[PDB]
Amino acid sequence: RGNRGDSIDQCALIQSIKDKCPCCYGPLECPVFPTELAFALDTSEGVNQDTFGRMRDVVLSIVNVLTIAESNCPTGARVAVVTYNNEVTTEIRFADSKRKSVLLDKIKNLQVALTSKQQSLETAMSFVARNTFKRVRNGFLMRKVAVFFSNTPTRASPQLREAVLKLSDAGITPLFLTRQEDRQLINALQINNTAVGHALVLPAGRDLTDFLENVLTCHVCLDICNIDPSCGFGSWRPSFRDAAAAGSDVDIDMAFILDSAETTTLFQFNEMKKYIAYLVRQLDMSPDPKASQHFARVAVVQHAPSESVDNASMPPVKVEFSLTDYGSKEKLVDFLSRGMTQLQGTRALGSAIEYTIENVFESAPNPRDLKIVVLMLTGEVPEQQLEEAQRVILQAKCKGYFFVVLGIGRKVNIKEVYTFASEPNDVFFKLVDKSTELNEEPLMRFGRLLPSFV
Amino acid sequence: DPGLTECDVMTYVRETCGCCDPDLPCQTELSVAQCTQRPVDIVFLLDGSERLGEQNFHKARRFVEQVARRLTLARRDDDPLNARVALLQFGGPGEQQVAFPLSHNLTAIHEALETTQYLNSFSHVGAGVVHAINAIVRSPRGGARRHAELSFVFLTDGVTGNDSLHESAHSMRNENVVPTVLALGSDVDMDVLTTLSLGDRAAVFHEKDYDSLAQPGFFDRFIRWIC
Amino acid sequence: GHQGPPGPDECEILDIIMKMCSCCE
Ligand SMILES: *[C@@H]1O[C@H](CO[C@@H]2O[C@@H](C)[C@@H](O)[C@@H](O)[C@@H]2O)[C@@H](O[C@@H]2O[C@H](CO)[C@@H](O)[C@H](O)[C@H]2NC(C)=O)[C@H](O)[C@H]1NC(C)=O
Ligand SMILES: *[C@@H]1O[C@H](CO[C@@H]2O[C@@H](C)[C@@H](O)[C@@H](O)[C@@H]2O)[C@@H](O[C@@H]2O[C@H](CO)[C@@H](O)[C@H](O)[C@H]2NC(C)=O)[C@H](O)[C@H]1NC(C)=O
Ligand SMILES: *[C@@H]1O[C@H](CO)[C@@H](O)[C@H](O)[C@H]1NC(C)=O
Ligand SMILES: *[C@@H]1O[C@H](CO)[C@@H](O)[C@H](O)[C@H]1NC(C)=O
């Protein structure tokens, strides 16, 4: 049988390719590792004829450097030029770039009328992450890059962090060629993982040679895997996105809450425990979780058993292992793979969450600052237990608990349980039409980056 | 199961190094994305042409109701999440029949789809496109909210009045439309479809048979496409 | 269950690489 294998290092394979390949050591094309390049032209207030001319000339220089894809084959950079203001509009689509010449003609002739509305740069990020980058070419080493241009300094608001998290979740590495330095934005980008964005400063008039060098070599052209050490990244942007290395003393505390035999067929249960085991494998458990003050701990909890309705003397949940119950990653992984078993009971979601947070998190010694509660729901949640559950969630959100919801199957309603996940629900709430989807890259990457979004 | 397989190295090499010939090994295109509750307004456009027929209209009705059911519809006109659905049927007269505007009123859409009546008359694709643009997007009520992307679904066999095709395509392009046409038949002009698709042939779904709308695989793929 | 292999290693990866890019310079 087996769950699955371990992927080899992406950079090692790429290097082994580009030295035994009579198709790579020729000309030095800029958009290596094909990319979808989104250009969010700033058509907001404070942008006049001259400013738009300069911005379009910067875009023209960049696209002149690139090599636009002209076939079904997955290579070259495909350019989508949108213009963003209080609203967002699309001028060039990814599939519209059939040839480089016609794309350049469209960009040069692009004369979108200047607007007189505020700069909703966060709306631009959300739209680019969700809509523009929805349908993109299949590829594991494909890159998603958006070059946002900003002239009016941003403001420190929660929606900015929400949009940054959405960008990170969608797999898109932003790049803000700001005209002026705004501390609020660069602080907002400072949620650092292997897909963290950056903000530059757009100079005046000429002197764009070194500026283009900086904005191309470190961000668009290669940006990865031999990243031109004189970039400042510090090897902080490889493929196969993960969180920061062990050097980051991340004080995470994750508790998973599963479902009973009610709509958790052994197939779905196997998939959920596989996902949990993979998530643990990609974390940093404390060597001694009982007495250590730093590092991480995990717990997995199942929904209520059958003999929990007439009374509440027994735990409303089958606590499979508390936070400080396993001190070694291998032991926990083996327990999840082999020792786990269903229990054939009812759900009672709100009571389960309350008991788990009141007798698994708090009971453990030295609680971590940031703690996460994952709910893996695979069945209908009766409305009578909806409200109470949400009420409990509110309390858990007051004590600092970030929530991840994974609705599995079609039976689970999504209209009501969407709000359970912490804000923004787009990234924290996840949908899977099948259990198998839990073990696919779009969700494994989200799980890996989960410590970053919290 | 290996972490990467023959197809994974296939695409690795085809991506990092280059291509030749283009030969297409394996099948991995347009990864799309498992849909969140992002706001999407889906407009369905049905063929009133004599060729479509009666039981074909019934199968298309079943498909439309099924997709409207499966998707997580919205709850108000200005909803920022979920999705909305509308149906249009272009026939003879310029004032095409509005089966229902963009609605989340699931009972309303079900009863309307039950009460919508086949036209069975000549029609024009461009006429239907312009009528939909001027009767849903430009409609005073139930118009596509700006933050919600618009997706035009074309239940057209392809053989239909072409009058105002390039003009209709330009009008759709202006309104930031993302058409996804369905070709239900074997005698479909690929070129009018390409014009309808606004450039991309991955936005046109070719069907082996009229009842292909009911197959679970096609339903799932299309649902992921629009949502 | 067992952790699946690392995929095409050595023989397989080299075979594929010399199979695709056998038509360029
Ligand atoms: C990367 O970020 C960490 C932590 O920063 C916080 O958490 C992030 C996920 C993000 O949300 C930030 O906005 C938060 O501020 C930084 O680690 C801290 O570093 C400072 C000094 O640099 C130190 O005093 C703190 O104790 C650290 N906290 C930890 C390790 O938990 C780290 O410096 C950032 N890396 C950079 C800026 O290169
Ligand atoms: C629209 O639906 C309502 C009831 O459905 C609920 O409300 C909707 C807004 C939507 O959220 C659905 O998912 C909900 O399940 C239908 O009910 C009508 O209600 C009115 C008074 O409110 C009553 O006079 C009618 O007789 C009801 N008709 C039926 C068939 O129940 C309503 O009819 C639907 N709209 C239309 C145009 O039929
Ligand atoms: C039910 O719970 C009560 C108290 O909650 C306890 O006294 C009783 O023994 C329980 N019955 C069982 C476990 O069968
Ligand atoms: C254009 O559309 C009209 C509408 O009926 C149709 O008769 C005609 O065949 C189409 N083709 C051309 C070239 O006009």
β-partners of residue B85 are B42, B103
Query: With the CA atoms of A134, A136, A140 and A145 taken in that order, what torsion angle do they form, in degrees rounded to the nearest 10?
Result: -80
Contact predicate A300/A256, CB 8 Å: yes
Pairwise CA distance, residues B48 & A188, whole Å = 53
Q: Give the CA diameter of chain A.
A: 78
Backbone angles phi, psi at A6, to 5 degrees: -110, 125
- State how far the alpha carbon of A411 is from the alpha carbons of A371, A408, A433, B106, B214, in Å: 29, 8, 10, 18, 20
Strands A318-321 and A297-302, bridge-based pairing? antiparallel
Map tokens 């292992």 to a residue.
Answer: A321
Domain ranges of chain A: 10-221, 253-453
Q: List all chains that touch chain B, counting a touch as 3 or more CB pairs closer than 8 Å.
A: A, C
Q: DSSP letters of A247-290?
A: TS----EEEEE---STT--HHHHHHHHHHHHHHHHTS-B-SSTT
> Which has the closest alpha carbon to B3: A238, C13, A424?
C13
Pairwise CA distance, residues B163 & B166, whole Å = 9
Strands A401-408 and A429-432, bridge-based pairing? parallel
- Start-to-end C-alpha separation, chain A: 35
CA of B108 to the centre of ligand 2 (A): 7
Q: DSSP letters of A352-402?
A: HHHHHIIIIITTSSS--SSEEEEE---S---HHHHHHHHHHHHHHHHTTEE
Pairwise CA distance, residues A430 & A418, whole Å = 9
Pairwise CA distance, residues A431 & A443, whole Å = 9
Q: What is residue A84's three-state secondary structure?
A: strand
> Which has the closest alpha carbon to A272: A319, A341, A352, A361?
A341
CA of B152 to the centre of ligand 4 (A): 22
Minimal Cβ distance to A5: which of C3, C17, C23: C3
Pairwise CA distance, residues A110 & A59, whole Å = 11
A161-197: string of b/e by CB count within 10 Å (b at 16+)?
bbbbbbbbbbbbbbbbbbbeebeebeebbebebbbbb
The best mutation among A161, A164, A165, A190 to test binding of ligand 1, ranked by most ligand atoms within 8 Å of the C-beta, falls on A190
| CB atoms near residue B145 (< 10 Å) | 17
Q: How far is CA A335 from the centre of its chain?
A: 28
Give chain B as a 3 state SS string. CCCCCHHHHHHHHHHHCCCCCCCCCCCCCCCCCCCCCCCEEEEEEEECCCCCCCHHHHHHHHHHHHHHHHCCECCCCCCCCCEEEEEEEECCCCCCEEEEEEECCHHHHHHHHHHCCCCCCCCEHHHHHHHHHHHHHCCCCCCCCCCCEEEEEEECCCCCECCCHHHHHHHHHHCCECCEEEEECCCCCHHHHHHHCCCCCCCEEEECCHHHHHCHHHHHHHHHHHC
Q: Which residue of C has its CA nearest to B6?
A: C8
> Which has the closest alpha carbon to B176: A85, A44, A133, A93?
A93
Helix axes C11-20, A10-17, angle to 10 degrees: 50
C4–A8 CB contact, under 8 Å: no
B16: buried, middle or exposed (CB in 10 Å: 19+, 13-18, 0-12)? buried
Q: Which residue has the CA at smallest separation from atom 19 of ligand 1?
A: A248
Question: How many residues appear in chain C?
Answer: 25
Backbone angles phi, psi at A403, to 5 degrees: -115, 135
Map tokens 């070194």 to a residue.
Answer: A210
Q: Which amino acid is residue A300, in one-letter code? A: V
Give A99-160 as a 3 state SS string. CHHHHHHHHHHCCCCCCCCCCCHHHHHHHHHHHHCCCCCCCCCCEEEEEEEECCCCCCCHHH
Q: List all chains that touch chain A, counting a touch as 3 or more CB pairs closer than 8 Å.
A: B, C
- Start-to-end C-alpha separation, chain B: 30
Contact predicate A132/A98, CB 8 Å: no
Map tokens 């990244």 to a residue.
Answer: A233
| Cα atoms found within 13 Å of the Cα of residue A166, Cβ hemisphere only | 24
Strands A401-408 and A297-302, bridge-based pairing? unpaired
- State how far the alpha carbon of A123 is from the alpha carbons of A43, A92, A127, A321, in Å: 13, 18, 6, 42
Q: Matching CATH topology for A10-221 and A253-453? A: yes
The tokens for A75 are: 């290579």
Pairwise CA distance, residues A150 & A271, whole Å = 44
| C1 part of contact set with chain B, CB < 8 Å | no
- Locate the DSSP E strands across A159-207: 172-178, 198-201
B183: buried, middle or exposed (CB in 10 Å: 19+, 13-18, 0-12)? buried
Contact predicate A260/A347, CB 8 Å: yes
- B90 CB less than 6 Å from ligand 4? no
Map tokens 């400042």 to a residue.
Answer: A232
To which CATH superfamily is domain A253-453 assigned? Answer: von Willebrand factor, type A domain (3.40.50.410)
Dihedral sign computed on CA atoms, order B151, B156, B159, B162? negative
Minimal Cβ distance to B149: which of A32, A131, A138: A131
Minimal Cβ distance to B20: which of C7, C16, C23: C23
| B199 part of contact set with chain A, CB < 8 Å | yes
The tokens for A360 are: 């698994």
Q: Which residue has the CA at smallest separation from atom 17 of ligand 2?
A: B107
> Which has the closest alpha carbon to B87: B121, B63, B52?
B63
Helix (H) or strand (E) holding A240: none
Residue A27 preceded by cis peptide, ω within 30: no
Which bound ligand lies closest to the C-alpha atom of B126?
Answer: 4
Q: Which residue of C has its CA nearest to A23?
A: C24
The tokens for B65 are: 């109701």
Contact predicate B38/A427, CB 8 Å: no
Residue A310 CA: nearest ligand 3 atom is: 1
**Chain C residues touching residue A140 (CB < 8 angstroms):** none
List strands edge to edge, sheet with B97-103: B97-103, B83-90, B40-47, B149-155, B180-184, B204-207
Provide the CATH number for the domain formed by A10-221 in this structure: 3.40.50.410
Q: What is residue A432's three-state secondary structure?
A: strand
Q: Indicate left, alpha or beta for A2 from its phi (over 0: left) and psi (-120 to 50: alpha).
A: left
Helix (H) or strand (E) holding A37: strand A35-42
List CB contacts of A246: < 8 A, sequence separation 6 or more: A284
Which resolution, in Å, applies to this structure? Answer: 3.1
Contact predicate B89/B99, CB 8 Å: yes
Dihedral sign computed on CA atoms, order B114, B116, B120, B125? negative
Pairwise CA distance, residues B125 & C17, whole Å = 48
Query: With the CA atoms of A85, A91, A94 and A100 taken in that order, what torsion angle do they form, in degrees rounded to the nearest 10?
Result: -130
Report chain breaks in chain A, C–N > 2.5 Å, as residues after which they occur: none
Pairwise CA distance, residues A385 & A373, whole Å = 18
| A20 part of contact set with chain B, CB < 8 Å | no
Strands B40-47 and A371-375, bridge-based pairing? unpaired
Map tokens 């007439």 to a residue.
Answer: A310
| C11 part of contact set with chain A, CB < 8 Å | no
How far does the CA of residue B224 sit from the closest CA of chain C (Å)? 29
Pairwise CA distance, residues A424 & A440, whole Å = 22
List CB contacts of B61: < 8 A, sequence separation 6 or more: B113, B116
Dihedral sign computed on CA atoms, order B62, B81, A81, A215? negative
CA of A117 to the centre of ligand 1 (A): 35
Task: Classify residue A19 by its DSSP letter.
Answer: T
Q: Indicate left, alpha or beta for B176 from its phi (over 0: left) and psi (-120 to 50: alpha).
A: left
A311: buried, middle or exposed (CB in 10 Å: 19+, 13-18, 0-12)? exposed
Pairwise CA distance, residues A2 & C8, whole Å = 17
Q: Give the CA diameter of chain B.
A: 60
A134–B32 CB contact, under 8 Å: yes
Pairwise CA distance, residues A326 & A285, whole Å = 9
β-partners of residue B55 are none
CA of A191 to the centre of ligand 1 (A): 8
Contact predicate B213/B63, CB 8 Å: yes
The tokens for A293 are: 């003050």
- Start-to-end C-alpha separation, chain C: 44
Task: Classify residue A310 by its DSSP letter.
Answer: S
Pairwise CA distance, residues B208 & A185, whole Å = 52
Pairwise CA distance, residues B76 & B83, whole Å = 10
Q: What is residue A438's three-state secondary structure?
A: helix
Which bound ligand lies closest to the C-alpha atom of A232?
Answer: 1
Q: What angle do CA A360, A364, A370 make, to 5 degrees?
A: 85
β-partners of residue B100 are B87
Contact predicate A406/A430, CB 8 Å: yes
Q: What angle do CA A195, A201, A204 make, to 5 degrees?
A: 150
Assigned CATH topology for domain B33-226? Rossmann fold (3.40.50)
> Which has the closest alpha carbon to A138: A77, A74, A201, A189?
A74
Contact predicate A154/A183, CB 8 Å: no
Pairwise CA distance, residues A303 & A180, whole Å = 53
Q: Which amino acid is residue A154, in one-letter code? A: T
